Ligand binder design. Structure first.
Ligand SMILES: [K+]
Ligand SMILES: [K+]
Ligand SMILES: [K+]
Ligand SMILES: [Mg+2]
Ligand SMILES: [Mg+2]
Ligand SMILES: [Mg+2]
Ligand SMILES: [Mg+2]
Ligand SMILES: [Mg+2]
Ligand SMILES: [Mg+2]
Ligand SMILES: [Mg+2]
Lengths: 135, 80, 200, 87
RNA sequence: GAGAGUUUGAUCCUGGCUCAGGACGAACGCUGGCGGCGUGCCUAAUACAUGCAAGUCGAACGCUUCUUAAGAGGAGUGGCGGACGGGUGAGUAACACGUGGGUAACCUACCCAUCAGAGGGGGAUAACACUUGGAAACAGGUGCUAAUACCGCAUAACAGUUUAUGCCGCAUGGCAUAAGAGUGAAAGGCGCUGGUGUCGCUGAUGGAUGGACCCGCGGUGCAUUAGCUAGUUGGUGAGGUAACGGCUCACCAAGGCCACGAUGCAUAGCCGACCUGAGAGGGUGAUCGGCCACACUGGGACUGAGACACGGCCCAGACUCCUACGGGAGGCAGCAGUAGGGAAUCUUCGGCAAUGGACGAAAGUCUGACCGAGCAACGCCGCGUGAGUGAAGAAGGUUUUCGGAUCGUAAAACUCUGUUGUUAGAGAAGAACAAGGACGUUAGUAACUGAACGUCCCCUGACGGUAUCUAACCAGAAAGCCACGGCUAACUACGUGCCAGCAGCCGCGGUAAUACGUAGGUGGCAAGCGUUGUCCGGAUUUAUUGGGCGUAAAGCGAGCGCAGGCGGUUUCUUAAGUCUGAUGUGAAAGCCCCCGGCUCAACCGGGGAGGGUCAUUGGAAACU
């Protein structure tokens, strides 16, 4: 471009965006608007717990939960690990991160936080999946 | 609440006195203006009474000295 | 944090005698673990860099952040060579001063003397093994602690000391007499690899 | 009122002070016009640094120190010089 | 100014995705010894239970209660302060902020310096005593009373104004002198012996201090927002403000702003600074400091030097509270704290000893400012969790080619230590003071008290019997987190069998998985580790530095031309751009350099350096 062009219209950068828009918003019941807040984790209520079939190179029953967030955005997350204490209406805590198998799951569920029971008999990579030491 | 009651009372009394004295000043001045409109020879003494009230209001914290000066100057231009 | 673990294990991973003795490599000069003696495969340049860095911090019992900050403070200097100044600043640590003066057999022993407070600088107690030392100071064993038999054994079992030091046995005081030198340090290390490592 | 006082610096349980020319309306640490020295009692005696010319100029221009600053300026001989210059 | 992986059967381009690093006011998970320093509602400017945050003066004044006329306490009037301090950042896209300037259009209690003066009088009012108001806060009525309260009388204008000159400036105009006309001030207390000194009182100036206004320039997105304004633009008058002016009213005219982005919409406190980056730049505006704005929402004034006032008044509205149901009262975005929201961020603590502020002659009273302590591994720094000797190498775990290998000098064992921990003793600085008891010097004195200045005596610590130091004792009470297919440092066994599950990207798993899970082992960090989320970089992936358009993305289908952008050679001229000297400012804190103190370090302090498409003046002019 010519410098005249670059003054008549400047370089307008490639607009960016997040891999987790649901975490980057909030809600005040008074004015009832999306409040933009950069929150690492959130709370939600599992509105469904089920299984899904992953993409073609893989084959499995991937455990998901559809969840109703504090900010009233409904979100599909993954239940990592082996086993869960979850049901519909079960309070849950959510963190970010894709699950490359299904597309519609941009989020993960956290273990050891709330009604989510810690994983059972997991001794390695233990902070992850949230289960206390075997003494 | 916190010892502001006394300042409420004293400020109201001050309001009374200060508004009274300003009204006195303004009545003197208006009287002089009407005298200058009526052309009576009392203008000479009413001028002095108006100046008197203006400066006595510059005293006692009613009137800033610049406002007093502007009033005296306006009255002077009316008389002379 | 401080390392309470084995010495020889570290030394024989790295493939070098840190104590200058040999028995931390003698009879088993291969990395630990049941994949130790068998045919190690190729290794990478990142591996070499990391190994050089780990040699130094395992010598001096140091932490990564201390190491990094000391590297930065050496970088702030312009009057010399970068990694050589880094090694000198490592040498100016009471852990190593006590060792080079022959006042203790190991850097762990030396650190323990320093921290337990058996040592002085210009006649003042110091429980800080990371204490920097300028050329000209006077390290000195605590005059009450000169009676321990451990240090007397360690001092009368002294091989010929380095060139950059001065020391007396009756006084149990010594000091640096030089910057000190580079080549008088362990030439087994390639400081350029640390430089490339932390240039990243 | 314009004043010549001292503002707080240094860590807790290890104080230090800068003598400073401050209105009484400003905070303990805030607006100031000029610094004219500093102070700490953490030595065995007290220890002081001063700028005689500027502090005497502000005293002439109408300053009004605090009690401890008056003590310090007495020890440093500034109040006496101001008195003399007024005589 | 380091790159790596990933499209393919493979190769090179193009092009995107991800990773390698640094930083959080961080949160979650697992674990968890100590010390130092700092930070801690980013969300609901949501609502506030409770407690405390602004009082002070008896040497301004008169009462009342207790003191054998002394001092002390209650409510009065009056003065000063309450406008600072403290909190928050909602609104605000504009002189709000920053920077540079201007005010011959200005104001300023307290503090300094100077010229002067402080005279004589008057009428009340609270309080208090009775009265009604009845739950009583309230409130009204009659009477008495003091003041540095109030009133007006006496004089000065040195204030301001007009005339006459002079002088100067940037037009309006400003400074010096003289004159004219008219106006206005007050307060006494304490002490000494009418004279007084001290604190206060009134006028004028000057300074300082802070404040008010005005201008250049600058800093955010949309044109799927192109027109906007009508007291709007200007003028003649008048009014008005501390002051300029449409600030306001009338009258006269129809002008004024904008494609250099007006208007509108959305968003937002701005800055010093902070994080990152080779830099250019980007992102943020937490803690500390500065300017602004707000105080349940909206409006308006009074008082006062100063407010259109967080803890003041009136009114309207919303919201709540106590009532004896007649009527009242309130406003935590002050410090703690509650509920709620939330992923989530503190004790309903001590003291004014310090430092600072109000008041006071002073002691001193007040001070949720501030000093400190407390909770939180939230962060940065430091030390630990023992050290030496100890073998072809205990058992046991794992593996095995069943010979052995590794956990492993690791252990047991013997020697030593006590950072730390437990116990017992000693026990700092931070404190300077002020007042008071004494002396001495100055200039004011008719003279002494007294003021200013100096030198001694005197007494003052919440933290805290904490830091710190000494001695006795125990290795004893003190290490975990993640990863190990490649990018990436780190490998085997068993179970499982496209299931369970892993996964930042490539992708692993379908009976022999270094990718799942466990065990062993190793590697990277370490009282932390890992993970998410956010910002920068790598990303030259918005390319000014620093990219491209034949086929990958892209040359409008093509032309005519307003505006703008650019423009042949050359003399003279200017000096807007440009270059350049000096001067000023760019606060402090912070980054950086040199120093110095905290057992080093973090941190703290001193000094310096630098920082502006900055401003005034003064030159060149080659180039535009
Ligand atoms: K704002
Ligand atoms: K408002
Ligand atoms: K595994
Ligand atoms: Mg770059
Ligand atoms: Mg309040
Ligand atoms: Mg490898
Ligand atoms: Mg895993
Ligand atoms: Mg298998
Ligand atoms: Mg094409
Ligand atoms: Mg600065």
């Amino acid at each position: 471009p010519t410098i005249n062009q670059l003054v008549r219209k400047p370089r307008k950068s490639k607009v960016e965006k997040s891999d987790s828009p649901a975490l980057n918003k909030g809600y005040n019941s008074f004015k009832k608007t999306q409040t933009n807040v950069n929150s690492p984790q959130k709370r939600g209520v599992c509105t469904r717990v089920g299984t899904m079939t992953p993409k073609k190179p893989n084959s499995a029953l991937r455990k998901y939960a559809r969840v109703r967030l504090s900010n009233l955005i409904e979100v599909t997350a993954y239940i990592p690990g082996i086993g869960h204490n979850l049901q519909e209406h079960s309070v849950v805590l959510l963190r970010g991160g894709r699950v490359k198998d299904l597309p519609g799951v941009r989020y993960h569920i956290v273990r050891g936080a709330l009604d989510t029971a810690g994983v059972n008999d997991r001794k390695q990579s233990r902070s992850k999946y949230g289960t206390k030491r075997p003494k | 609440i916190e010892s502001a009651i006394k300042r409420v009372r004293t400020s109201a009394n001050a309001n009374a006195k200060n508004s009274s004295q300003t009204n006195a000043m303004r009545t003197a001045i208006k009287k002089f203006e009407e005298a200058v409109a009526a052309g009576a020879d009392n203008v000479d003494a009413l001028y002095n009474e108006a100046v008197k009230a203006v400066d006595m209001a510059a005293t006692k914290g009613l009137i800033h000295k610049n406002k007093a000066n502007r009033d005296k100057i306006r009255l002077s231009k009316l008389a002379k | 944090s401080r390392y309470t673990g084995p010495s020889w294990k570290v030394s024989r991973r790295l493939g070098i005698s840190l104590s200058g003795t040999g028995k931390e490599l003698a009879r088993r000069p291969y990395k630990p673990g049941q994949h130790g003696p068998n045919s190690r495969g190729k290794v990478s340049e990142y591996g070499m860099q990391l190994t050089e860095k780990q040699k130094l911090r395992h010598m001096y019992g140091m932490n990564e952040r201390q190491f990094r900050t000391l590297f930065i403070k050496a970088s702030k200097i312009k009057e010399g060579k970068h990694g050589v100044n880094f090694m000198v600043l490592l040498e100016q640590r009471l852990d190593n001063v006590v060792y080079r003066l022959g006042l203790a057999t190991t850097r762990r022993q030396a650190r323990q003397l320093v921290n337990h407070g058996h040592i002085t600088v210009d006649g003042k107690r110091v429980d800080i093994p990371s204490y920097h030392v300028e050329v000209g100071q006077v390290i000195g064993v605590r005059e009450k602690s000169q009676n321990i038999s451990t240090i007397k054994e360690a001092v009368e079992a002294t091989v010929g000391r380095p060139a950059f030091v001065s020391f007396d046995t009756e006084k149990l005081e010594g000091s640096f007499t030089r910057l000190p030198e580079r080549d008088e340090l362990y030439p087994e290390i390639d400081e350029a690899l640390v430089v490339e490592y932390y240039n990243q | 009122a314009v004043k010549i006082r001292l503002k707080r610096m240094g860590s807790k349980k290890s104080p230090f002070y800068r003598i400073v020319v401050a209105d009484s309306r400003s905070p303990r640490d805030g607006r100031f016009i000029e610094t004219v020295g500093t102070y700490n009692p953490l030595k065995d005696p007290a220890e002081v640094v001063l700028k005689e010319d500027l502090v005497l100029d502000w005293l002439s221009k109408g300053a009004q120190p605090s009690d401890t600053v008056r003590n310090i300026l007495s020890k440093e001989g500034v109040m006496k010089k101001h008195h003399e210059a007024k005589n």
